[PDB]
């Protein structure tokens, strides 16, 4: 790819078709037609699952064409649906929101192993635990 | 001190002569003369120029470092020459060169004609830009300041005479 020209990382949940109210002007910073985006993104949405918090980088090129490479959903929200605690952090030091098994979080990170920039998966999975400490959890096994 | 002990590499063919307290050098560009402070004992005596804090005077080391940078920049002038790129930001601001006088229409009710001191050949490659060359770092810096003294860059749209690499911190209108 190229250097910083006109792209940033945004776009929340993929289930939200045409997120003009939330994102808004960020799409308008460039000449990005949102329906042109929905034409391509929703063409990629119907591949695995619908209604998941997804992150994508809207990389715009000079010839008016734009490409996008998606990524795995946030470990923070993966922490909310896998365990069933939809609140999030809230109060990490006052109320421990939830807890999950090591075996579970390891294989969840193993799939993300091909999506992460790490070398040791054991070290990579405890990084998710570091996020779990940020969300207010207890690593139980 | 750290700059006072640094020898100055004077280029080949460049004439330098130390007449006691006064110094006169000359390269391809021009003749720059300067009188040093008595607290510094300077000696050519070589292929380079060494500086020494003469005895008696207490602040000798401070004065020595000063004198070094002067002659260092003096040999850069007589051999290369200095350039000051000025940019005139703003609609209606045109520059002109007439012999040795710069004509500037800086939005006033009258054109301002600045007189160039000596050896300063100003040139405007563009009507909104002035590439000004010279032979001495001191006076080239001063005349660049004077043209900027006619119109300092206002912090709202950056209108006015500025430098090439000058960054202007623009303020914003209160509400709208």
């Amino acid at each position: 790819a190229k250097k910083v020209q006109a792209y940033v990382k945004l776009q929340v949940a993929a289930g939200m078709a045409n997120p003009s109210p939330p994102v808004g002007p960020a799409l308008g910073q460039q000449g990005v037609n949102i329906m042109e985006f929905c034409k391509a993104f929703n063409a990629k949405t119907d591949s695995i699952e619908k209604g998941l918090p997804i992150p994508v980088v809207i990389t715009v090129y000079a010839d008016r064409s734009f490409t996008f490479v998606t990524k795995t959903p946030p470990a923070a929200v993966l922490l909310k649906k896998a365990a069933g605690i939809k609140s999030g952090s809230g109060k990490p030091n006052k109320d421990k929101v939830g807890k999950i098994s090591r075996a579970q979080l390891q294989e969840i990170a193993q799939t993300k192993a091909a999506d992460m920039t790490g070398a040791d998966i054991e070290a990579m999975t405890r990084s998710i635990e570091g996020t779990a400490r940020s969300m207010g959890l207890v690593v139980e096994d | 001190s750290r700059v006072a002990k640094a020898p100055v590499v004077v280029p080949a063919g460049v004439d330098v002569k130390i007449n006691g307290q006064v110094i006169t050098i000359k390269g391809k560009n021009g003749e720059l003369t300067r009188t040093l402070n008595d607290a510094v004992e300077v000696k050519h005596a070589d292929n380079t120029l060494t500086f020494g804090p003469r005895d008696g005077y207490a602040d000798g080391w401070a004065q020595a470092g000063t004198a070094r940078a002067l002659l260092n920049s003096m040999v850069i002038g007589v051999t290369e020459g200095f350039t000051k790129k000025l940019q005139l930001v703003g609609v209606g601001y045109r520059a002109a060169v007439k012999g040795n006088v710069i004509n500037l229409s800086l939005g006033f009710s009258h054109p301002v004609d600045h007189q160039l001191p000596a050896g300063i050949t100003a040139e405007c490659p563009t009507q909104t830009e002035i590439v000004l060359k010279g032979a001495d770092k001191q006076v080239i810096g001063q005349v660049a300041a004077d043209l900027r003294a006619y119109r300092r860059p206002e912090p709202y749209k950056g209108k006015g005479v500025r430098y090439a690499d000058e960054v202007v911190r623009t303020k914003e209108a209160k509400k709208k």
């Binding site: 920039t117 790490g118 070398a119 040791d120 | -």
Partner: protein, 131 residues
């Protein structure tokens, strides 16, 4: 980096890699970013993981102070940023020609991959390695 042993903790890590060393090369990092950081460190992760030496402390009185141990042919490596690469498993492994593939892959200024030892000469890219 606090005291003398702080320098020595790096040198013991240094000589440990030299005590079982093999083919090696060098690439500078004055034009590289964090993007190419994970291109050769993942290459290290392609071998096994982290222990692939890429420690950058090659001062003429630091890493050269650690060269008299072994690999004496590395005396005048001195300046021009040096980043090493070890091959503990696999005598004459792929790590040498990895920079040939890398120089054409987002690395532009790579100090001309001058290399260090084993051809018992100066830099020359060997492609006829025992696979």
């Amino acid at each position: 980096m606090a005291l003398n042993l702080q320098d020595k903790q790096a040198i013991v890590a240094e000589v440990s890699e030299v005590a079982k060393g093999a083919l090696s090369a060098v690439v500078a990092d004055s034009r590289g970013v964090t993007v190419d950081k994970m291109t050769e460190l993942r290459k290290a992760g392609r071998e096994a993981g982290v222990y692939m030496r890429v420690v950058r402390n090659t001062l003429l009185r630091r890493a050269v102070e650690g060269t008299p141990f072994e690999c004496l042919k590395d005396a005048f490596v001195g300046p021009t940023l040096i980043a090493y690469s070890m091959e503990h498993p696999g005598a004459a492994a792929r790590l040498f020609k990895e920079f040939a593939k890398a120089n054409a892959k987002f690395e532009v200024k790579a100090a001309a991959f001058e290399g260090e030892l084993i051809p018992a000469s100066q830099i020359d890219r060997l492609a006829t390695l025992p696979t």
